[model samples]
Target: KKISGGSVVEMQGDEMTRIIWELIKEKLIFPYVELDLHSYDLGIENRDATNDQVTKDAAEAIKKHNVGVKCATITPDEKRVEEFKLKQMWKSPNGTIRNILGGTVFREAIICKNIPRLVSGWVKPIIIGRHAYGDQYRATDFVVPGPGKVEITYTPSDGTQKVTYLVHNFEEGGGVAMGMYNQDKSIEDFAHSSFQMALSKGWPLYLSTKNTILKKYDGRFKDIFQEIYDKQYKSQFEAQKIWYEHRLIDDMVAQAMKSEGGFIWACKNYDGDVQSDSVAQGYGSLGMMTSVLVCPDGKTVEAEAAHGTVTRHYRMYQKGQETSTNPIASIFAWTRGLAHRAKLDNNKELAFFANALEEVSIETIEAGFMTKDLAACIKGLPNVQRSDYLNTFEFMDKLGENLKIKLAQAKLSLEH
Candidate 1:
């Protein structure tokens, strides 16, 4: 007999994707696993109802409970605000939560398998882990286009003298020019978390940037990573045949195009933004990308589907129309997070359970059971027909069925 222990997971969502969110809970999660779910509805309406207090409460609950699985909610632009008829459009739940939880990594990279790429020739997932704090995403700057001077300053705020630096380009100059800076403290945390995650996966880590050009600025990042590598992880990396290196942004992007597979390509904010789409497009589905937030200590993490709630599927379901929505990433959200949890608990069975679930998802597709998005991917290639794959609910339920069968069979095979 196996002891069934349950953990709590919180959910937040926007329109469209919110509808698909319900199907996931009903068809996939409920029938199979006995979970202790502490659910929260972060729909745009509800968000405006309590002035987004519910969102904060949810985030707090997650902090206390140690796991949060969120659905993508709409970060309403003006149009969405009018469409939703909200009192006021709220900021992103993700952004708000990240603010509350300091020192998190947002990595991005493409998953690939002979899918034609804009940057052709990358056979493996480059895994571009992002340093979510500091630099561009949180920088302060202003425009000084008319031969005016602009300066950036840092005040210790400890009653000491303020530090200031002047920035200007003598003439009627280029647009979007801004200066950014990050503290040694934040970068240190970013490097440690990334390297630790890479080491866990037995994957090499490469932190890329335009350091040569931004010598004083991006150089700090390069140096920080080097400092950690030299003092903390260099030897271990070498022994493991995995190491961290710096590459010029252009050169690294070029090298990645030619490379075959497997490595964590650590990135700065702007780069992560640009490159993750490349990775997602390569992977062939926004629905297939799963995200995990790893904290600085490498002890706390929360994982979830990277794409938004399935609004379209929800619409179809409401109209009493049958729909085929991709649920792989959501499944991985559970498995990957649980898999990470298993690592901490040192529970081999749980780890195997997660691995088994993930394998079933991939193998199920590889075996010609996939969704509309995926079927479109296999159009020219040989594959099972539209009739072959199960509908949305059926497919997920099948994964649950397959997960149990696969794990049990593996155990029996192991015993024999």
Candidate 2:
């Protein structure tokens, strides 16, 4: 019998992932669990036709439903604009979604025993929770023309005395100046999400900032995390036998390099953008990374693959050529979102199904039935043989076959 997995906001996307997304539901998900899926067509063409209203509707649906599983979509550039004959260059859908749902994006890598990581010492996953809000991303930057003064001013709405500070003076040649700000509320939310992720995973949490130098700016992030941790999350974290600490960004990077990798690192907007990519590379492939946007309430979540739509693979498949694109991360996107839904609905069967799918994905790879990228990780890309790896469809069918056997065995054991 199929388990009732409850409601989920399902977002379809573009290219190769779109094709795999359908196959995943057919082969793995729909057979065992029935979901009340609110489908949103976030495909590039649909997004253009709707003038991007679909993206907004999708975010709002996620807000209502509390769980979303998204396929990788294209954030168009100049070439994409010309190729798609778009109305205009649309803003990133992910960015638009994040703006509507204030939260932290935590990315964790999937580990398989057979696939070798760039950092061989990293046996466990290092989850990075990025504060995807203001700071450098929303900064006001300008070129200093001649010799002039750059100043920042704050005027209170209540007609209080204005406060002004001189930022810099361009006494020499032309240079550049930038000013950035972050809200206390956003920082507090980031803390809550980070703490919630660490607690859920039963791992320690660390907030990294350059508080010593940027005493007020970066220090505020450190202070907010500490204050909230002590006031709200400290006891809960202690109960989980996990702790939260502050580390300098430089020291944190160094420590991350040496550690065995079983912690959540909370980074500022810019730091998270850079460090997440670095961490993703170290783990091996972006194809193995799963991204989750966890709201401050800790009840709402959106999950997706950390990688893009795999345009290269799509191009090959378009030419009717065989491709061996790995689908683990995309598959995890579903499991993670479904796992959250299971938690919300208190559906044990759905939870077990989600976990079993995840385990089978990893087990499939560990048993040497994997795609080209992971096979290349074990053996050199130049040395990889055709027999060493399965093509995309074959791998999916392998997972389906194994999942059927596993489920049947579980049913038999229950009958006894």
Candidate 3:
């Protein structure tokens, strides 16, 4: 019997993940759990066809339903624009949704005991919460022609005195200059979400910034996090035996590299954009990373694989070739989203089911039933044998079989 409770906003996507998405639903999810699903097709073609209104509608649906499980999608580039014959080069769907939801994206690796990490000391996972707004992403940059001056002026709205800060005076050859800004409101939300994540995971949190150099700019980030921790979340964090502190960006990187993982690191926009990829690689394959967008309220959540659509594999599959793509991260997107739904609904049965699926997926891999990517992580890519890993469909079937046995045993034990 399937456990039933609550609604889930499901965002379908592009390429190989799109194919595996359906397999996951048919084999793993629908078999054990019944859901009130609000489905949205976020595939690239649909976005172009609908003038990307579908993406907006999907974000609104997630806002209303409070939980979304998304499949990896393509963020079109110039090449993709030509390939797909898109009406225009649409923006990243993830970015579009995040802007609408106003949240921090926290990415954590899914650890399997047997999979060896490049950072051998990191047995536990390090979660990174990225503040994805403003800074370079929204900066105004221009090329300075020959000799000139650049300055930033701020005029107060209350008819107060205006202030100007000289940015640069181009005395030599031409150069480039940029001005970036971040809202205090956005920083407040980032801090709250970071604190909320750390409290939930029972881990200490660190906010990293180059405050030593950009005193006013980075210092604001450092100050805001400290203030929020002291005022709003300090008590809750202490009760969990956890804490939040700020670290200079350089020092934080060194600390993160040497330390055994299990802490949440809050990074400014550009830093998070760079370091998240670095951390993901250190852990192993991007196929093993899960990303969650936690709104400041913490009640609204969006979960997804921290990877793009597996295009190479999708090309192989398109040619009717069998491929052993790893589905664990995609599977985690469902489990994590459903787990949030379980919490929101206070459905113990649903929680247990979500947890069991996650456990079974990891346990199955630990027990040596895995995909080609994971097998290559264990055995070298060149040395991996066909027998070492299952094809995509086979791996999903294996999980379904293991989950049924695990659930049946739980029921039997309860009866006793």
* lDDT score, candidate 2, position 411: 75
Scored by lDDT, model 1 comes in at 0.70
Candidate 3 TM-score over all chains jointly: 0.90
Each model's lDDT comes to 0.70, 0.89, 0.89
lDDT of 2 by residue, 273-387 (tens): 7888789879887788888988777689999876878888899999999998899999999999999999999998988888989999999998989998888888989999999
Name every residue pair that clashes in candidate 2: none
Model 1 CA lDDT for position 144: 53
- TM-score winner among the candidates? 3
Q: How far out, in Å, is residue 236 in model 2?
A: 6.4
Clash pairs, candidate 1, are 16-310, 16-311, 17-309, 17-310, 17-311, 106-130, 107-129, 107-130, 108-128, 110-279
Query: In model 3, which residue pairs have backbone atoms overlapping below 3 Å?
Result: none
Error of 2 at 416 (Å): 6.6
Q: lDDT for model 3, please.
A: 0.89
Off by over 4 Å in 2: 136-153, 163-180, 199-202, 230-243
Window of ten residues with lowest summed lDDT in model 3: 132-141
